Curated annotation (Swiss-Prot):
Cited InterPro entries: Prot-tyrosine_phosphatase-like (IPR029021), PTP_cat (IPR000242), SH2 (IPR000980), SH2_dom_sf (IPR036860), Tyr_Pase_AS (IPR016130), Tyr_Pase_cat (IPR003595), Tyr_Pase_dom (IPR000387), Tyr_Pase_non-rcpt_typ-6/11 (IPR012152)
Domain of life where this protein originates: Eukaryota
Catalytic activity: O-phospho-L-tyrosyl-[protein] + H2O = L-tyrosyl-[protein] + phosphate
Effect of residue 67 to K: In JMML; also in myelodysplastic syndrome
A GO cellular-component term linked to this record: nucleus
Residue numbers carrying Phosphotyrosine: 60, 64
The name this protein goes by in its record: Tyrosine-protein phosphatase non-receptor type 11
Positions annotated as active site in the UniProt record: 433 (phosphocysteine intermediate)
Length: 502
């Protein structure tokens, strides 16, 4: 699972890897070092290596000669089984058969790389819990590693002596890893996963359970500024934190069967970017829309794609069914000469029907970063189903990359939050962009984090990657790029200072 991804390898190194340890059908993915933000699919075929560009501009993974995907895991799963119709110019099939596995452990949640014996004990003593563990580089034995495991009962600081921390040396000799006896492993991940399944037992009988990695991402909101400083800059920083998050995407390959159904195929903007069955919005007014409920784990959201001409009516059905009263559009109808969303609302002062739904554009206000549209939504034949829907259209998202300052986003979401809150029993806030995962994901996560701070003040804990992972288990690929990942941190930092300045 995600071992075919090699986060710190060069193009030539990848070639040599595939040529020396691979066979025809072998492959790996890697970040493009030439095209930052983008990726490369390196495949061995007919005795040599081909490199295949995978572009990600913030909306999705665009495989050259292939299709658009929500995550690299989903792309690889796609080809490595059903509908592996990957080809090139000539029309030749390119087979993805043998994942060439990576041995670098940096993006393992339990691997902290560069860290000392004292700080390690600090983390394990405070955040630590029964079965919490971690692996750091040995400073006293270069090339070697230390595994540290907390066992006992309760968590956090204790003095009852009912808990303890054990340290196990991991020797690296001749490119393989062991704990001083027994099996030797080709990588630290193999070793760790072996001892998770077969726990080490001490003579006196303490079983060293490797239950959960220690959390090293959670911070107190007050000190986000300091955390950003360290992650910015050897010890792991932003890049490793993000790559560690990406690695966990392989836990999220849930079914999206309803999306793949023939009847619903043309209801998806992008054919392979689908909602999870278990969180999709079911329309019980067919029953299909490309949307998922996102629930923070009071205010919820619906992340959805931009409407197609044949899904406009379904979009409005969804809005009515869910009692949604606020809609956040983060896209222009067309960007870089590409359709991203059809106009699904009437011109100002006009009234339109969309199947059984009827919508009136009452009034448009404009601001710097956005236009607000007051819409009246009702069901035809029923002159009491009228509800006001507020459509916030954010227009200042740069066509390439992310905004240089988060202040417009923050002011926008602040305004969106007050609107939602003013309307008792309003359902989820609808958020959409092209595929409903890039910007949508970014806006939603930022909104989630700020709400924690708005309600609990400067003195609360936030965990960006964990919030993102929680959101990703509800819609595929939410938050697409490391760029957006940094932008989330910047936005929460910026919010904090504007809070304290007042």
């Amino acid at each position: 699972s995600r071992r075919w991804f090699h986060p710190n390898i060069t193009g030539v190194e990848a070639e040599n890897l595939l040529l020396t340890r691979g066979v025809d059908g072998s492959f790996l993915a890697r970040p493009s070092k030439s095209n930052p933000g983008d990726f490369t699919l390196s495949v061995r075929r007919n005795g040599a290596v081909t490199h295949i560009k995978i572009q990600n501009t913030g909306d999705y993974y665009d495989l050259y000669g292939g299709e658009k995907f929500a995550t690299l895991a989903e792309l690889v799963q796609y080809y490595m089984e059903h509908h592996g119709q990957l080809k090139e110019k000539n029309g030749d099939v390119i087979e993805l058969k043998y994942p060439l596995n990576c041995a670098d452990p940096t993006s393992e949640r339990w691997f902290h790389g560069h860290l000392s014996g004292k700080e390690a004990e600090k983390l394990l003593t405070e955040k630590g819990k029964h079965g919490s563990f971690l692996v750091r580089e040995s400073q006293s034995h270069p090339g070697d590693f230390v595994l540290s495991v907390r066992t006992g009962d309760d968590k956090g600081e204790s003095n009852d002596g009912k808990s303890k921390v054990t340290h196990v040396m991991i020797r690296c000799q001749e490119l393989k890893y062991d704990v001083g006896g027994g099996e030797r492993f080709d990588s630290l991940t193999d070793l760790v996963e072996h001892y998770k399944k077969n726990p080490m037992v001490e003579t006196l009988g303490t079983v060293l359970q490797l239950k959960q990695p220690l959390n090293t991402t959670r911070i107190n909101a007050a000190e986000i500024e300091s955390r950003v400083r360290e992650l910015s800059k050897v010890k792991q920083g932003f890049w490793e934190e993000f790559e560690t998050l990406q690695q966990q995407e392989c836990k999220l390959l849930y079914s999206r069967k309803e999306g793949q159904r023939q009847e619903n195929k043309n209801k998806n903007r992008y054919k392979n970017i689908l909602p999870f069955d278990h969180t999709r919005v079911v329309l019980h007014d067919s029953d299909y829309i490309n949307a998922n409920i996102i629930m923070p784990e009071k205010k919820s959201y619906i992340a959805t794609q931009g409407c197609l001409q044949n899904t406009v009516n379904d979009f409005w059905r969804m809005v009515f069914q869910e009692n949604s009263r606020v809609i956040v559009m983060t896209t222009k109808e067309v960007e870089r000469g590409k359709s991203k969303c059809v106009k699904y609302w009437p011109d100002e002062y006009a009234l339109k029907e969309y199947g059984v739904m009827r919508v009136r554009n009452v009034k448009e206000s404009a601001a710097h970063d956005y236009t607000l549209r007051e819409l009246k939504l009702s069901k035809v034949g029923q002159g009491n189903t009228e509800r006001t829907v507020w459509q916030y259209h954010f227009r200042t998202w740069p066509d390439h990359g992310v905004p240089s300052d988060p202040g417009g986003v923050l002011d926008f979401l602040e305004e969106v939050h007050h609107k939602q809150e003013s309307i008792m029993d309003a359902g989820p806030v609808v958020v959409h962009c092209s595929a409903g995962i890039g910007r949508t994901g970014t806006f939603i996560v930022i909104d989630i984090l700020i709400d924690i701070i708005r309600e609990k003040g400067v003195d609360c804990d936030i965990d960006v990657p964990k919030t993102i992972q929680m959101v990703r288990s509800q819609r595929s690929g939410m938050v697409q790029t490391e760029a957006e990942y940094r932008f989330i941190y910047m936005a929460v930092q910026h919010y904090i200072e504007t809070l304290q300045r007042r």
